[PDB]
Amino acid sequence: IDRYEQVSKDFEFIKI
Amino acid sequence: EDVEIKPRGYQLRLVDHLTKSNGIVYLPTGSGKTFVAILVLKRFSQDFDKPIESGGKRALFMCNTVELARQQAMAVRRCTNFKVGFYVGEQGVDDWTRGMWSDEIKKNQVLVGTAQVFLDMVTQTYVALSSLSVVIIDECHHGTGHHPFREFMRLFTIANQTKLPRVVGLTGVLIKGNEITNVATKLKELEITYRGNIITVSDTKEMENVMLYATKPTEVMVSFPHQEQVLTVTRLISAEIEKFYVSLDLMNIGVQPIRRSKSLQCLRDPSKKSFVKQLFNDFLYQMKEYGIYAASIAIISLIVEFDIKRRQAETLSVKLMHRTALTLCEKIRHLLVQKLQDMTYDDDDDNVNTEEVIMNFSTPKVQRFLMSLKVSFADKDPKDICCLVFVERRYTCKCIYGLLLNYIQSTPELRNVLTPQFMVGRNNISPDFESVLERKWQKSAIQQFRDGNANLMICSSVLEEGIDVQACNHVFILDPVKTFNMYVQSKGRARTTEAKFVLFTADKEREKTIQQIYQYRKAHNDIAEYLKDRVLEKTEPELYEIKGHFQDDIDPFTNENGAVLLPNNALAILHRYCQTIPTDAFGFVIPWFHVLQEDERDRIFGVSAKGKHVISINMPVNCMLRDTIYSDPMDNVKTAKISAAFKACKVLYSLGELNERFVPKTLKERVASIADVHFEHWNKYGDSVTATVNKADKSKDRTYKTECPLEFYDALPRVGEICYAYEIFLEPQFESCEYTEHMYLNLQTPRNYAILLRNKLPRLAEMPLFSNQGKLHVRVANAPLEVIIQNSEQLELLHQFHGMVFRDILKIWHPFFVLDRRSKENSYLVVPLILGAGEQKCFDWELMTNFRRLPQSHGSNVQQREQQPAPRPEDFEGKIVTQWYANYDKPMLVTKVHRELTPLSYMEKNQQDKTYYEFTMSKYGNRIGDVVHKDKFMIEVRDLTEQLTFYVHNRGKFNAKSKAKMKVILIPELCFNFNFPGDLWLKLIFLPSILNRMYFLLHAEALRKRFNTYLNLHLLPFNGTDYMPRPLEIDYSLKGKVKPLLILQKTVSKEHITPAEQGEFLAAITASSAADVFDMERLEILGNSFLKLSATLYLASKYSDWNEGTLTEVKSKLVSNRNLLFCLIDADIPKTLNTIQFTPRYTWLPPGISLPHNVLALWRENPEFAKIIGPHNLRDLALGDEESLVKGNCSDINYNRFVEGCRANGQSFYAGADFSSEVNFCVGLVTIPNKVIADTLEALLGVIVKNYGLQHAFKMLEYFKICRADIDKPLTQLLNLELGGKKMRANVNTTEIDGFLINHYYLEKNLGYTFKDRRYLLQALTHPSYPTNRITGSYQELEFIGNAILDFLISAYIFENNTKMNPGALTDLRSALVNNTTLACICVRHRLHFFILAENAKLSEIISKFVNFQESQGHRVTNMSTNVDVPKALGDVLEALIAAVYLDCRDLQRTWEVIFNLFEPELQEFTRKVPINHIRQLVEHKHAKPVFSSPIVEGETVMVSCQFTCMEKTIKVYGFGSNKDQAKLSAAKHALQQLSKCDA
RNA sequence: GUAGCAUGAUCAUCCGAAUCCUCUACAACGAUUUUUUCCCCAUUAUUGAAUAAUGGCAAAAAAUCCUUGUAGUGGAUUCGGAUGAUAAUGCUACUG
Ligand SMILES: Nc1ncnc2c1ncn2[C@@H]1O[C@H](COP(=O)(O)OP(=O)(O)O)[C@@H](O)[C@H]1O
């Protein structure tokens, strides 16, 4: 895959 | 702090409940539990004041880690007013002893430390468990299995079960590990092990809300997608790493210690190779887990660690492999940075470029981590935010630190808010990235976190517990949550309000993490409710199950004195004792464990051996436990090891190797045990060997009394008794020239004088003298002449004549001198003899009747000279004259009478026109006036030398023709005439030297008689005497086939025995300070060598069951100066020594003269007043002839005036003056340095050896109570010293030893000797690092006696052969000839290195270096050696196989043959050239002035700045060296080479 | 007899060198021990499925001991160099 994918740049924390 | 620290409502009830009963308090971390603990400690402050024996007690505060212990110690110290003792293993209590342990106990009320330290202190009986008040236990959850807490608690079970101290445990977590299910059994185990009942808050709404100020955190979870794709670069890295692994396994280094499984079932890789492989595996795991850029960060840490390891790599092969690993890691870093920059081309702005690279070249989980950070802190104030991050691996912490630093620098928003830091456990990794010790630092990472310098901390579980950390608000967990305890403690760390607990995990493990967290929450909730609903029991009083809790193991054994040996500490005790034994680097201390075999198991044990496992414990050959020991049959190999070690240590204690306190014994215990046997006599002198404080003022030197020999004691003849007259004779050894014939003819006249005695005098040796004109000899008649003093007035006249001789003729008189009437000490007379009835020599009654007092030379004038009678030639021929006319008041001796010559005759020389008379007028006419009887004759006179001490040869250009070139002719009428037999006068000046030397010779003869009687020799050569010799090589007195040694020959054959003559004894007595022609320093070396040999042999044959170290220490202690002095003082010898230079007029007392008897008594009665009497006071008294003749005691008014003058010194400068240097000889006292006595003991031993031999000399040691010889083995103290010293280990016979020794014949032919027993050679060849041998012991026990044998043999040879060369360099020659490096050169010369049955990594390399260096030098001594270093073991094994050769032969003659055969070239080289001085000769060089700075050793290198001077210049040079002193030695060697080249 | 020069020895004081060490505070080194955890494997009880028992393989945590180096001391022995001063010896002038 050569280049690692970008995880969600916008990501608000989830609460258990 | 102060008293403002106020407990809450629950702490008071907790303390009240804990007072009534023991228990474990359980509260969340940060609830103030330490405060309630110290509050409990307040309630036990009753017995802390009183000491232990008075009935008081102390307290114990327990901790598991050093830093936590220190923190709580300072906390309690600031929170109370108790003397807080702090003891840890690092502090140095390992060598603490009884008294300064007890004073520490009594000087403290509360004690803190690590569990091992307190456990060791308790087991060693420093305190009794019943002597304690309360033992506070912290982090009590650690107490399971073999943890030190449980072991310490067991002592409560094994100690007295009454009046036992309170125990309380502290924790915030109760369980360690994954043992959550069925909490109740674990909790009950904790209950019983600490014999307490857990107490926790239950009154909810009152103080649960209160203590919840340490609020629980909010827990959130964030997932990340898995990564699956594998980059090609990763597989390239893997391929390179695996091929490097293969190469590393293939490549060869020296022999290394062998490691294997924990159960030892399977082998393992070597330690260092395992270490490097482990580092590489950790790096691979890092790069797998975190990606690419993180590996780029961590490869720097790998580089720095590998470089540091190479730098400290002593072995060349280790350096090579570390360099190879460094090259591999450098290639990895090059590829990594190449790939890193491969995508940096896009944007030229470094900030965003590095940021996007971080988000690009990293695993997604770290990316989510970074977004979490960025949106969490969101550019807030830096000081407020204090977050924590936990990771598992150590190198992970440094890697994430590097990544975080790079990101923070790449984020300007976070570039000023986050100041991270990382910290890990004890196996510390250098936080630097560049080089070792770049700069020093003093703030711990924890400290910087506490100061706000580090708002972020990266750490493993090392920061989970204990360490005081202020209330943090954020905690992040990267690696998966593992244990219940760490999870609960971490969530308890988040103490402040609205603290966030955050953790990250992969998507596919979300359900597993949910299960784990819910399981842990259940584990906490059921525990809480179980405590809330538990059964009300008091203190777990069920003693039966309490004992059943521990019975499963091996029951600990306790001996008397209360010392108890914990089985779980058996491994520690045994390994520590093994470490106490000295060894080289590879020389293994670990007892090589082994696992048995079932066939062997039932071959050695019964049928039960098949069910369970048995093992064996071996012992390195250095110790005496050569017999192997087998463990009891145990199921698991673990308890098998425990049992094996326990039994082994029990046997060791039984042998006494372990002290009573169950700790290995040092040399102090050995010397303490030996003191009451071999150093008993020190007590009578107020000193002891164990008193190490005696090492302070050893230079102090004491005084001694003196007494004349027995013959001279109270031997004044009595009137009416028989008396012995002993004639003196004078034979001029020199031939006389024309200017000296007067003395030569005069002293040979038959008219001589004699010494008069009332006791008989033994035969005396002929004595040499050194006149101003030649050499002289003196002999004393053997057969005395017999007279009886019928007239008391004859005796009175004799005494008057003897007194007046010293009073007038020799000018020895003193104002206080008085003829002795008491006649006790050194009383006798000397009387002249005249030719009597032919052969008879009666007394010169004429001289004494006339010359009672010498008349005074008066200045006769012309007027009285007219009627004075003319001078008769007979009246003046050979008579004493003096020149009263001139200023010269000394006496004169005439030689011949010039009858034909007359005044007005010209002086022959230089005044052929000037006559004697006219010259006399021109010279002293104002005084003489004129000469009457002008036609009379003249005479010829010669001077009498004023010198009195003729011992030293006054070497010089006397110029016999020029000294008396002037000729002295006088008119008789102008000089006084002492009509006297001038020959008697010129003999009389030599009297004092003869008197003193015969005074000492009498002591010498008495000693010779004593040592001939005590050793019981009364054979034919006992009688007679020999002429006294003199030495030339004594500085001041300037003017094939081996030859068998004579000492061994006389010790084996009595035909060559020779009787000891007075001269040798006297020389042994004459100190070098009393500078005569000889002294003892030539015999001192032989005495020292023989004493060393005798002490070595006796100790070896007496304490053969001891190791080399204690034997060496004791042997050195034996021949110490203190012990020799103490053993000699009670031998009654020192009061008969010759130490003081003999100056008669001021430092000598005449025989017939003493002080006044009354003042003698006053001096001998007032020691408080003796020390103030001064020589001026003594000279103050003016005693005329009456006082010195008729009374013997001064006048009472004069007595009072003298004592007043003595007392007046107190208020003057005379007070406190060291008058002993001037007045000790007035009462027969003297002060002698202790070194003199230490020398004279060996001096006597040397002659007693030389004349007789070893065997007879052996008795002398026991005579001086040197060694308490055993009567149970009489042959030991006489002959078994050359026949004993072995035990069982040199008795078994087997051919297997030929397996150990390969081509032994080659070594035997190189050495020259043939061994009847090869076992001795193997023992001497048994280096300590050689486990495979089990038939014989090590080589130290052989080297110990080899050293003594070699040094004694070489000293005997150099003394017997190297004659014409002074002892001051003989000591240097022997020291050089016994040097270890010389022995190493000898060993490599015959290539004995090949046969050294040893194995070691660095030792093999260093011996290879030394041997190839010597090959380069061609097996020649480089006089020292410029090589890097020398192997001590090489010279050791050579000089040990010397003793092996002796023991195989048991013949000192063969030993000398072989030693000479290898030492021939080196002996002829050292005895021809200057042997060696080195170093010092540069310092004291005529123009070379070398000074040096502090050398620093760096790994395998050391440099030193050599600041010297050469050829009137100053040059700066360096040299290759090993250590600091070796750097100095190499610099000195280079300076020596430069000086030699400059001279050349 | 009188001076100068040279020399030997000794005390005292200062400094140095060699050997042996001790103590202090700091740092490094190596070894051993104890707890905990994961993975995998083996052997059994049973044969496949499934279990159980242990035993072994890697990771984290904690203690103890030894060694080395840094410097300061301090001590013992040997010994040198420097110097007041003391006394001794020899020589070279002035002589007696
Ligand atoms: N009732 C109280 N009285 C006095 N000090 C308290 C009280 N409650 C809490 N503290 C303080 O709060 C601190 C809590 O931290 P500490 O108890 O040392 O951590 P741990 O609970 O791990 O021992 C204590 O140092 C203590 O001084």
Ligand SMILES: [Mg+2]
């Ligand atoms: Mg913080």
Ligand SMILES: [Mg+2]
């Ligand atoms: Mg605490």
